[PDB]
Amino acid sequence: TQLNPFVVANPAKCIGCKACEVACFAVHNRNNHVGATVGTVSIPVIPRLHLIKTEHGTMPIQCRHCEDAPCANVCTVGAIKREGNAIVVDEKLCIGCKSCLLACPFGAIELLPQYEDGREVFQINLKLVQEPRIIAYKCDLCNDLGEPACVKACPENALTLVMPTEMKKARNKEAALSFLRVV
Amino acid sequence: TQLNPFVVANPAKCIGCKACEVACFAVHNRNNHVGATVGTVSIPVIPRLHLIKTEHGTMPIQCRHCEDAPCANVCTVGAIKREGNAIVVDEKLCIGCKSCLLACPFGAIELLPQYEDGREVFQINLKLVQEPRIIAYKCDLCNDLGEPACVKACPENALTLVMPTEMKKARNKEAALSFLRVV
Ligand code: SF4
Ligand code: SF4
Ligand code: SF4
Ligand code: SF4
Ligand code: SF4
Ligand code: SF4
Ligand code: SF4
Ligand code: SF4
């Protein structure tokens, strides 16, 4: 078992241009007839990270991939699993219980209607107009796909994928060098 | 333990040609790519003795290498130490605490930026640009190298390296011969 890497923003180099959300929506919805052209998208837009603005600038936030994740523990059905290096949600066993929305201190999980093959997904017996199935969305760290598209789509290069082992060693070395040069 | 030598000028045979400082600068900075040729000097020039000119002529002044040296005593960090026969500053531990400039009454210590391997030496955390490291420069009587270079470069042969023991004996013998020939 190894530390889960995660993606973190940077308030000094973010402008709220929303160029990281659309790349996420394009890359994580390849099965809904998208061809890197605006106009072929016959579905509503669903990103995985979220951009929010305060008086101290604008920043996006997303799942930090906690090891002892509250969302994994609270989920009774077992949709949330640690399949790969990052914690991922399964869209087959989700039942729509809002417990995840209580579990996450950061609120990186959203509940949105599911869209497959360019058309709205419907359930069997509900209410008379039918109701669409609701699915939890969160960042998968693009394990099935290649490199993350939230990074490399930033004009100012703000979002960074960090391994929490290298920063610790680098900061330790910097602190040791700073203290050794004076004494 | 014996008296330390110190170079002294001679105002009768000094002109103000500044050809004794250049030799010192060229002999101390062998690690900054100097080849006894103007053009290979890629660093600003820093001598150790300073020429001063007033109404009654001109002369150079430098460190007299005091025994109970005020500069060594006031230095809290411990940069200035009597390592050899002469008194020498240490470039590793100096922090630029300017108390030396309040200690020496002659003023043979000057604070100037350091230059190592032909480039300016910067610090770790200061100001947004960096700032150069400042070191105290003073005469070290060429202890690491051979005989003094300010002498053997003076065209008029004004600078002399005096040992304060032989000079006293010479003056005593001169006075004794002058007085004993008359009684
Ligand atoms: S919303 Fe889905 S993943 Fe979250 S607890 Fe309910 S079933 Fe599990
Ligand atoms: S959804 Fe929230 S609680 Fe769950 S792993 Fe991500 S950041 Fe942690
Ligand atoms: S890693 Fe993939 S799913 Fe996660 S925020 Fe980036 S683009 Fe979206
Ligand atoms: S693409 Fe970069 S600069 Fe633009 S909103 Fe996203 S993180 Fe901020
Ligand atoms: S300037 Fe350097 S040599 Fe002078 S007292 Fe301070 S540390 Fe010592
Ligand atoms: S720097 Fe000044 S006080 Fe210190 S030894 Fe030289 S002459 Fe004396
Ligand atoms: S004795 Fe040596 S170090 Fe001192 S001023 Fe002369 S050349 Fe420079
Ligand atoms: S080289 Fe001799 S004459 Fe020329 S400035 Fe120096 S001490 Fe005076």
User: Which one of B124, B125, B126 would you mutate to disrupt binding with A, by most A Cβ within 10 Å of its Cβ?
Assistant: B124
Rg from Cα positions in chain A: 19
Residue B54's SS3 state is strand
Strand partners, B137: B110
Q: Rounded distance, CA B150 to CA B148, Å? A: 6
For chain B, say whether A180 makes contact (Cβ under 8 Å): no
| Residue A14 CB–ligand 4 contact under 6 Å | yes
Contacts of A177 in chain B (CB under 8 A): 124
Cα distances (angstroms) measured from residue B17 to each of B53, B54, B58: 11, 15, 10
Contact B86, B3 (CB under 8 A): no
Give the residue from B159, B115, B167 showing the smallest Cα distance to B141: B159
Distance A146 CA to ligand 6 centre (A): 68
Buried b (16+ CB within 10 A) or exposed e, A133-161: bbbbbbbbbbeeeeebbbbebbeeebbee
Burial of B129 (0-12, 13-18, 19+ CB in 10 A): exposed
Q: Rounded distance, CA A66 to CA A137, Å? A: 16
Length of chain B: 183
* Residues 6+ away with beta carbon under 8 Å from A135: A91, A94, A96, A111, A112, A113, A114
Query: Per the annotation, does B50 bind a ligand?
Result: no
DSSP class of residue A38 equals: T
Give the residue from B69, B125, B132, B119 showing the smallest Cα distance to B99: B69
Strands A115-116 and A119-120: antiparallel
**Alpha-carbon dihedral of residues A7, A10, A13, A14, nearest 10 degrees?**
80
Cα distances (angstroms) measured from residue B64 to each of A66, B79, B149: 68, 18, 16
Burial of B36 (0-12, 13-18, 19+ CB in 10 A): exposed
Length of chain A: 183
| Residue B60 CB–ligand 7 contact under 6 Å | no
**Alpha-carbon dihedral of residues B150, B152, B154, B156, nearest 10 degrees?**
150
Q: Rounded distance, CA A57 to CA A73, Å? A: 34
The token duo for B65 is 């290498």
| Residue A18 CB–ligand 4 contact under 6 Å | yes
What 3 state SS string does B84-150 have? CCCCECCCCCCCCCCCHHHHCCCCCCEEEECEECCEECECCCCCCCCCECEEEECCCCCCCCCCCCC
* Residues 6+ away with beta carbon under 8 Å from A122: A130, A131, A132, A133
* Residues 6+ away with beta carbon under 8 Å from A107: A101
Strand partners, A137: A110
Contact A109, A100 (CB under 8 A): yes
Contacts of B94 in chain A (CB under 8 A): none
Question: Helix-strand-coil percent breakdown of chain A, rounded to 5?
Answer: 20, 20, 60
Q: Rounded distance, CA B14 to CA B17, Å? A: 8
**Alpha-carbon dihedral of residues B144, B145, B151, B154, nearest 10 degrees?**
-120
Query: Per the annotation, does A142 bind a ligand?
Result: yes
The token duo for A117 is 């093959």
- Residue A137 main-chain phi, psi, to 5 deg: -115, 135
Cα distances (angstroms) measured from residue A136 to each of A106, A139, A175, B124, B144: 15, 10, 42, 48, 75
For chain B, say whether A12 makes contact (Cβ under 8 Å): no
- Residue B96 main-chain phi, psi, to 5 deg: 80, 15
The token duo for A165 is 């082992």
Ligand nearest to the CA of residue B59, numbered in listed order: 8
Q: Which residues line ligand 2 (CB under 6 A)?
A: A 63-66, 69-71, 87, 103-104, 106, 108-109, 138
The token duo for B58 is 């001109």
- Residue B54 main-chain phi, psi, to 5 deg: -135, -170
User: Which residue, chain included where needed, has tokens 């394990």?
Assistant: A143
Which method was it determined by?
Answer: cryo-EM
Q: Rounded distance, CA B183 to CA A38, Å? A: 120
Strand partners, A6: A162
**Alpha-carbon dihedral of residues A47, A49, A51, A52, nearest 10 degrees?**
120
User: Which residue, chain included where needed, has tokens 């290979």?
Assistant: B40
Q: Rounded distance, CA B151 to CA B7, Å? A: 9
Contact check, Cβ <8 Å, A181/B124: yes
Residue A161's SS3 state is strand
Q: Rounded distance, CA A139 to CA A156, Å? A: 21
Residues 148-177 of A with CB under 8 A from B: 177
Contact A32, A117 (CB under 8 A): yes
Query: Per the annotation, does B100 bind a ligand?
Result: yes
Smallest CA–CA distance, residue A57 to chain B, in Å, is 22
Cα–chain center distance at B81 = 15
Q: What are the start-end ranges of the H helices in A81-151?
A: 99-103
Cα distances (angstroms) measured from residue B34 to each of B18, B39, B117, B151: 19, 9, 10, 20
